[PDB]
Amino acid sequence: IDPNRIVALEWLPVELLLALGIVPYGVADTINYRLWVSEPPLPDSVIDVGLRTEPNLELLTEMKPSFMVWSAGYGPSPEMLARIAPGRGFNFSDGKQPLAMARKSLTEMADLLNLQSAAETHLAQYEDFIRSMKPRFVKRGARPLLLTTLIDPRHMLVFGPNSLFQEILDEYGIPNAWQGETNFWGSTAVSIDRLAAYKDVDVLCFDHDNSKDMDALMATPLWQAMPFVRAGRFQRVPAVWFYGATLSAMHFVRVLDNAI
């Protein structure tokens, strides 16, 4: 109800709020939100309420949030959270199309806050931006694309058909190189060797203040032996949140455009 006393316990609803012009009263893990999501800027005034997986329950109670928002099936139990203050959990996807859900979640949030018009204006901006950038990729053919991020020297996260990015790749005619298994959120962790299978594809790897790991990884003979690496198709790019919504999707497009 009070638009200035909303606490977002997970980054997905943080993005939904910012899209509607709401300044979050409190946000979980602002530090990492700044380096994993980055693009949508969070003012310094925002109170940090702890890790998304272990929010400072004491601080939350002291704060007396007007409403709390979080991600479905992630973090603290909703039954327990509901004991602190009114709230709503948002879905990232239906297991297949995250962006379709993003548009629904944004509408949902806007209805709760009576910012229906603001939602419509943002959604128009979103669809127009996506469509306007389509010609920037008419040059490339059917060469598939592999989207990844380094978890640790021994494991790479890869994003599949049900990831946030797929809908955009489909609109731009870019095949997704990963057609293997994925988790609900569209990703899966694989050993570095599993990446050697991809002989001629473009590979983007989202940085997240992990130059030390990328160095160790890129120093192994295996990495140097990677066909797409030797072919000069590997590229490190700025961080883009892969479990976000429309803002993350637009940020992806900007990063995508700059890369290919």
Swiss-Prot record:
Upregulating conditions: Induced 1.3-fold by hydroxyurea.
Instruction: Provide an example Pfam family for this protein.
Output: Peripla_BP_2
Site positions per UniProt: Interaction with FhuB: 54, 56, 58, 155, 191, 194
Domain Fe/B12 periplasmic-binding, residue spans: 5-260
What keywords would UniProt list here? Ion transport, Iron, Iron transport, Periplasm, Signal, Transport
- Entry-linked PROSITE patterns: FE_B12_PBP
Q: Which domain of life is it from?
A: Bacteria
The UniProt-reported impact of residue 36 to L is:
Decreases binding of coprogen. Does not bind aerobactin and ferrichrome. Increases resistance to albomycin
Q: Which Gene3D superfamilies match?
A: Nitrogenase molybdenum iron protein domain
What post-translational changes are documented for it? Answer: Exported by the Tat system. The position of the signal peptide cleavage has been experimentally proven. Can also be exported by the Sec system.
Q: Record's GO cellular component, any one?
A: outer membrane-bounded periplasmic space
An example GO biological process term is: ferric-hydroxamate import into cell
Localisation: Periplasm
**Where Fe(III)-coprogen is bound, by residue?**
36, 52, 71, 74, 92, 185, 241-243
> Could you tell me which PANTHER family the record lists for this protein?
IRON III DICITRATE-BINDING PERIPLASMIC PROTEIN (PTHR30532), IRON(3+)-HYDROXAMATE-BINDING PROTEIN FHUD (PTHR30532:SF1)
Quaternary structure, per UniProt, is: The complex is composed of two ATP-binding proteins (FhuC), a transmembrane protein (FhuB) and a solute-binding protein (FhuD). FhuD interacts with FhuB. Substrate-loaded FhuD binds FhuB more strongly than FhuD alone.
Which family, according to UniProt? Belongs to the bacterial solute-binding protein 8 family.
Tell me, in a sentence or two, what this protein's role is: Part of the ABC transporter complex FhuCDB involved in iron(3+)-hydroxamate import. Binds the iron(3+)-hydroxamate complex and transfers it to the membrane-bound permease. Required for the transport of all iron(3+)-hydroxamate siderophores such as ferrichrome, gallichrome, desferrioxamine, coprogen, aerobactin, shizokinen, rhodotorulic acid and the antibiotic albomycin.
The name on file for this protein is Iron(3+)-hydroxamate-binding protein FhuD
Q: Which organism is it from?
A: Escherichia coli (strain K12)
